[PDB]
Amino acid sequence: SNFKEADDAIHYRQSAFSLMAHNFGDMGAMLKGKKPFDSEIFAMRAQNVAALSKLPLEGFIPGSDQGETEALAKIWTEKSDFDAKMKTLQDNAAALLLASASDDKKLLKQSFMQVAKSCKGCHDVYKKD
Amino acid sequence: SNFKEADDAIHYRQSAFSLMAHNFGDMGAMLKGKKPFDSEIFAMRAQNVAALSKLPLEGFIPGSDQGETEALAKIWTEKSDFDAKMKTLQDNAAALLLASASDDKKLLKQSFMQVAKSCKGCHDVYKKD
């Protein structure tokens, strides 16, 4: 295994998701007008989200559904669909990174919403209530 | 500020460092023979370390030296030198990513050691004992 104990795998994936959320939420705040929009900071965030999105799958090792985690056990009996949702997150984050190189606000919002749908769609099925 | 409270900034930088350490340590384990060396996994790790190294500086916001943190207060009275160490970490991680595209083991070890010196050199000065 890549981790000494199961708790290390849980902490790893949780930390990657938390960092993803900070960067993704800053993009959302800018698009929603909650803070000033800045195209360079937006692109920096999109790069961070794309890089961070490659990290958490590693942490979903067998046997790491016990203890202090919000990951449902059915992740590991439906692992093919789970992995496919994670892969789609990657593609969507790559599209948002590409969109961040342009200044078309509607295309930015559209690409952002596709990533957001990836986050929520996986959570609704595979994260504890 | 990019963070709602100081504890959020602390958690952010701590999480980025923790993820960096997992990826960096896997490269070290492979170079030291503690686990089988794999050039593709090594390159994946080098990319992750380079991406993650761009994240933690954001978290060192003014006033976030109180509470549950190992960051010393002198980070903020010596912030120029601190930032310069972080920038050098970036350059070193970029060099290790470039080295990971080749199969020269001595050059890989040399580039890895330069990053490791960045980690320890900053810790020795700016992280609590």
Ligand code: HEC
């Ligand atoms: C499945 C394919 C997921 C996708 C895509 C995204 N997330 Fe998620 N997330 C998932 C799980 C199974 C869990 C629980 C992990 C655990 O071990 O507890 C999470 C958790 C989070 C969290 C909380 C992290 C923590 O501090 O404990 C956050 C903030 C989070 N996820 C955010 C997030 C965002 C912003 C996403 C899209 C950009 C996203 N996740 C995708 C499963 C999946």
Ligand code: HEC
């Ligand atoms: C200064 C310029 C640093 C460089 C370069 C690196 N690190 Fe570091 N690290 C630094 C500080 C000030 C702190 C304390 C942060 C806090 O708020 O507590 C840390 C902390 C860590 C940790 C512990 C994280 C945690 O879970 O709390 C780790 C595992 C860590 N740092 C690893 C690490 C590695 C592997 C580095 C090089 C690749 C590296 N850091 C560079 C300051 C600095």
